[PDB]
Design a protein around this ligand. Structure first.
Ligand code: BMF
Length: 130
């Protein structure tokens, strides 16, 4: 209702992740960091690994003040799979649908998230004045 803007924004981001993005068919390889046991050279090819659980952990620490830095990490999941698996691999097409669902949901909530983003930024600027 008031002064809870960051808490609310993060709460919505987590629900987008758990309810929309993690619900993509066969998306489970993206729910957690790549297990080196199964992909022995992943961390030698991908310099900035990223996954949905890592994004949730970021959300719980309130890393994202706007959807833009949230989308940076989401789009990073797709670009990593493009680099490691190739553009037409089934992994990449799954990750591409994870990204699509993310954008579709953000667009559904656009006006609402803009309001939270404005209030979060103006509060941070006013709090750093002191
Ligand atoms: C070299 C042939 O191509 C590949 O095998 N690539 C990929 C493979 C897997 C993958 C496999 C098996 C398992 C059990 C898991 N589960 S987890 C989240 O613990 O690591 C993941 N994820 N993956 C992701 C993301 N991006 N690429 C891949």
């Amino acid at each position: 209702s008031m002064d809870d803007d960051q808490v609310a924004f993060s709460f919505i981001l987590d629900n987008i992740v758990t309810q929309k993005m993690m619900a993509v068919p066969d998306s489970w390889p993206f729910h957690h960091p790549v297990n080196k046991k199964f992909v022995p050279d992943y961390y030698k090819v991908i310099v900035n690994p990223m996954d949905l659980e890592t994004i949730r952990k970021n959300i719980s620490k309130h890393k994202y003040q706007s959807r833009e830095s949230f989308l940076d990490d989401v789009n990073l999941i797709l670009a990593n799979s493009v680099k490691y698996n190739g553009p037409e691999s089934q992994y990449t097409k799954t990750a591409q649908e994870i990204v699509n669902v993310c954008y579709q949901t953000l667009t559904e909530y656009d006006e609402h998230l803009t309001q939270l983003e404005k209030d979060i930024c103006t509060a941070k600027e006013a709090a750093l004045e002191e």
